């Protein structure tokens, strides 16, 4: 129990890290959407102004 919850937190922390550093622009959109966490197909294309 308590231990497994801590591990979940650790996993959550690892997940946040992986999002920020491997998936460049996403910090802005994390707030609102509650429900169905569907794995939004991170179209890589947009960044380069160039």
Partner 1 sequence: FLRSLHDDSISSSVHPGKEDLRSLSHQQWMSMAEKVWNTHTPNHILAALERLTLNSTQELKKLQFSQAADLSKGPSCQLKEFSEPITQSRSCNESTHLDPQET
The least CB distance from residue 35 to partner 1, in Å, is 26
* Residue 7 C-alpha from the chain's centroid: 17
Q: Classify the C-alpha dihedral 6-8-14-16 as positive or negative.
A: negative
- What the block records as the tokens of 1 is 């129990």
Within 3-22, the residues that bind partner 1 by CB under 8 A are 3, 6-7, 9-10, 13-14, 16-17, 20-21
| Residue 11 vs 33, nearer CB to partner 1 | 11
How far is the C-alpha of 50 from the C-alpha of 33, rounded, in Å? Answer: 31
Residue count at the site for partner 1 (CB under 8 A)?
12
Which stretches of the chain bind partner 1, using CB under 8 A? 2-3, 6-7, 9-10, 13-14, 16-17, 20-21
């Amino acid at each position: 129990d308590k231990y497994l919850s801590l591990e979940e937190q650790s996993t959550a922390a690892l997940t946040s890290f992986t999002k920020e550093h491997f998936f460049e622009g996403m910090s802005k959109f994390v707030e609102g959407s509650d429900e169905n966490f569907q794995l939004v197909q991170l179209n890589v294309n947009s960044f380069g102004e160039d």
